[PDB]
Amino acid sequence: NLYFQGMNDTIARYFDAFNAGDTDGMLACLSEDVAHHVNEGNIRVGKEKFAAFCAHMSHCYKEELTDMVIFATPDATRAAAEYTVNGTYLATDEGLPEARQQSYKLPAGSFFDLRDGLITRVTTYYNLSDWIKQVSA
Amino acid sequence: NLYFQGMNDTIARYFDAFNAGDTDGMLACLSEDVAHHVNEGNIRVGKEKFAAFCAHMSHCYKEELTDMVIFATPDATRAAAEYTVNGTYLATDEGLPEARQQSYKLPAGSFFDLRDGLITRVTTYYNLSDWIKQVSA
Ligand SMILES: [Ca+2]
After folding, report:
1. CA–CA dist B135, B91 (Å, integer)
2. Between chains, do B40 and A4 touch, taking CB under 8 Å as contact?
3. Which domains does chain A have, with CATH numbers?
4. Max Cα separation, chain A?
5. Which member of A2, A41, A75 has the closest CB to residue B5?
6. End-to-end alpha-carbon separation of chain B, Å?
């Protein structure tokens, strides 16, 4: 059971870009065939969809990630991170509770597939019911 | 880029025990103060609760985990695992759909804290909406 940094630098860049509000930096970390596995949702393929997804998030939420742990990996083609999402609910996300600038804080995690240093798959996990409880009410 | 070896394979033992249906083996991987995060509002602490929880699972589901990838930190105090859950829904779990021996397959992920080689925290995520869709079919 050997572990190393693998392609973790890409994962670091990705999250750093997120915290900077830099979608361009995030997109730069992704392969053209990127499969985004939406929590409690569907699988969205490609950068056009990803950019749209980011825009949507940018409208609804203002967030910063803290307590970031990017795990050592047994395989350069895989990665994992656990962290804390801190945010403000700026504008109502369709189907979710009404936004009134609620403050929230939630544990989260992400798993990835990589190919040659680019993320080919991203799966983000968090407890949606927990979040809903915080913003409802 | 250097490597390290995680010699104490507590996480692997834990999942191996799970697969073998050996709750004793799972319990042995945990600290007396283990915090089982079902959700924010519901953190079950200790081995008595965990054993009851396994009995509950044992009643409702039969599952095997495959495609296991385990991640670590150099200090050995944090870990993550991504895998595939393959099961049969044996008996109804309160608030979930009716059990009819439906088969299901879905990805899942777990995050752990460890101290002195024992699991002190366990959190597991998966696409619940997807699961519900699968068993409702
Ligand atoms: Ca046993």
Report:
1. 12
2. no
3. 1-137 (3.10.450.50)
4. 48
5. A2
6. 48
